[PDB]
Symmetry: D2
Subunit: 257 residues, 4 copies
């Protein structure tokens, strides 16, 4: 496949619904060698199962709120993958009270802080921690959302955190380009999931999108997974510092009434 010979780290698998599960599946189908991280003990088993299913026994814990957690994980990784070809960052967080109602009223200093720390800083923290382990030709990928570009109801402070994240992509891309490392993001559309979201009225969002999206359907984790695999392969060597919208053309239309 087009990822044959690549060794890639995938973060944020939490369930088969997780965008990262879709990315891992597709990367694995294209031949990449995979490693996985899990945030906490309550997730370990699951992830360990999925890894197995994808031919991997590299399964490490990592909580991005902790520097030491990140250092330790790469220390362990280095035991098996002294050098590797990049990683997928599919992680985010904000306290739920932040995600419901009038932004101005909902937002708090702490909520703001946490959201940006976990959803944005973590991306460069990881890079900082594995920089010297990366091969020439490596690629880093993160998952964004249209909320970084437009004010969306209830998404609230996540919007600011994702904007911060998209700038992080540009700053990282620029800084690590010359060493041979590419950095991009995928701005995915809302993905249908029966599972309960923390974002107030997500279902409504979904329904709306299906209706006014040019391609007339919401994207799947397979759509995202396939774009992610490509952006992480040498096939996209001419692309860096880019935020690729994988939302079926949703953001480019207006008034599809």
């Amino acid at each position: 496949g087009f990822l044959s010979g690549k060794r890639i780290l995938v973060t944020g698998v939490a369930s088969k619904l997780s965008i990262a599960y879709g990315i891992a599946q597709a990367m694995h189908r294209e031949g990449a060698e995979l490693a996985f991280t899990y945030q906490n003990d309550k997730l370990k088993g699951r992830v360990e199962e999925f890894a197995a299913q994808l031919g991997s026994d590299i399964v490490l814990q990592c909580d991005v709120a902790e520097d030491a957690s990140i250092d330790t994980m790469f220390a362990e990784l280095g035991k098996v993958w002294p050098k590797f070809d990049g990683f997928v960052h599919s992680i985010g967080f904000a306290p739920g009270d932040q995600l419901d109602g009038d932004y101005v009223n909902a937002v708090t200093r702490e909520g703001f802080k946490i959201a940006h720390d976990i959803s944005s800083y973590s991306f460069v923290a990881m890079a900082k921690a594995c920089r010297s382990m990366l091969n020439p030709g490596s690629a880093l990928l993160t998952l964004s959302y249209l909320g970084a570009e437009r004010a969306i109801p209830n998404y609230n402070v996540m919007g600011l955190a994702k904007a911060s994240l998209e700038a992080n992509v540009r700053y990282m891309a620029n800084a690590m380009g010359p060493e041979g490392v590419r950095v991009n993001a995928i701005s995915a559309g809302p993905i249908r999931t029966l599972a309960a979201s923390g974002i107030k009225d997500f279902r409504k969002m979904l329904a709306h999108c299906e209706a006014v999206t040019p391609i007339r359907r919401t994207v799947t984790i397979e759509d995202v997974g396939n774009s992610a695999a490509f952006l992480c392969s040498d096939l996209s060597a001419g692309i860096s510092g880019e935020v690729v919208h994988v939302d079926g053309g949703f953001s480019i239309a207006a008034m599809n009434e």
Copy 2:
């Protein structure tokens, strides 16, 4: 003038070179009544002097790092201006080490945190605190920079913080619009000063802009002040949630060689 009868709070005057000084000056010329804040004791006397020069005796302290400090200030302001028409937010900060050299190597969790806290969160923290005191037809304004949209050397983490700030402008605009409050930003070009910059190689950056800027000069605090006054008046009633570039066209050109 076109600000006649308006009452506006101006923050971040620190010197005659401060962007807010140019803003207060122009606003005062157009007939606004102003109030001033100052960060700490070292700055109090300077602010008091400028304020008198501009006909104001409302000079209050406010450190945006503290919620208590913001509340206290608005509580005191409410003594003389029980309702007002908006404020200018011309504040930012990042620890020195953050603005020199390779972004990824320079960035730290703490640095990121302070940068986003004082530079982006503070804008909404102020709005939350005085929401009830604003008149319909009120306008809020903050100062941004191109680093939010493009990766610029040495600006590093401040780049991410401004991005978050411009998203704040949109989320704030959308939330407060229906109450009749407008929220905008001005992405100002680098301004020439004799003072010294904490941003590594700022002088070089000036020299370059001057050369390739379509209007062939850097903009002044009068340029910025004039735009801010307009953005804060009833003359811009149809503009909200916008980031207006006041940089003489610099950002719209490429390779002016």
Copy 3:
């Protein structure tokens, strides 16, 4: 006022509903001296009446489809205003059939051609013709619409023509900057009228904007006029090559439901 002593040519007045009327009105209030053009004989008397109302007796004909017509007009204008300070370009056109239904089915080579010719080329054609007559500190302004950035139903080919127009603004800005001419555009929101629109379902489009527009109302020609006056004054000396959105924040929100 802030336009005092300025001499500005205003094009595209056709009625009291015309955007240019709102522009001339506001500019006249701020102290500018104006001149007016009119497309053909059917419009001459209306323009003459408005012009007198606004203290001007310079009313000249100009059909932008013709180079000769542009030259002739500036030759006549030069009789009274040998040098002036810029013009407002508020002209556009596309044949009826182009603005109804499926874009791909509606578009034609001719339609495309006329649309781009009168709607985009005319802006630079005017600048080329009067370049030598402009004072340093002059400003040119054109009127755009969101259709340039997003695909909006029925706007169809005009969408492509406005995109070309906004690029014209940047190329013009960059070319004329060093001579001291500024060039900008205002991307105005849909304005409510009793008149009738050639854009299929314009009324629906209004209704929708009203609902989801952050300031909860459509903008007026006074809103636009006020912004244009500012953009054409020395107060915006640091703004060039910009497309300022005067649509009450509409474009920066999504799913205001």
Copy 4:
């Protein structure tokens, strides 16, 4: 390969240096079945040679300045490919006098017209002509350039034409989405070519780009070809109406001094 089973039409092969040659090579490596067009007789032989080398004997003449030319070509194509899966539009043109010096001085009504007709209209003209022949799951691709977003010296009116083109992508995407056809563009960086360009000082552009581009090299026709193959495959089913920058991160940085 990932294009196995697809039948794709490639326009604008003129030499082995042509971006379309790079796209055809990569699509052919991924298994697509190809057809080729040539503009005029002086190009026929060459193209016929290249097609042969890529396992194709479908080689038709087509001059996009002519509607009948386009109709006739699809008539002929339909003889062998009654239905197919899309096409690559790698065509553009402007008279050379347009591409040198001050934009305002260089631009003419005719030059403007031609540039937009051949470089932009042709893209929707082709779609219009083969709409009913397209399979569900089809994709259309065009080649843009950063000049559509920023004022670039000497690129002049091509800039306006490319902006028009990028809007065409959005309008087309929106209009044909619901039938199952995707439409995107690739905004490629300047590509090194020893062959003589019509754009004044192109070499300089090249040199500059190599130096300040994050990845520190210019992209190749292989880089572009690979992105094009992906964007034309079902692998990018979640992407439509997008302008993907394939320029090594060049457009996202500033002041790489």
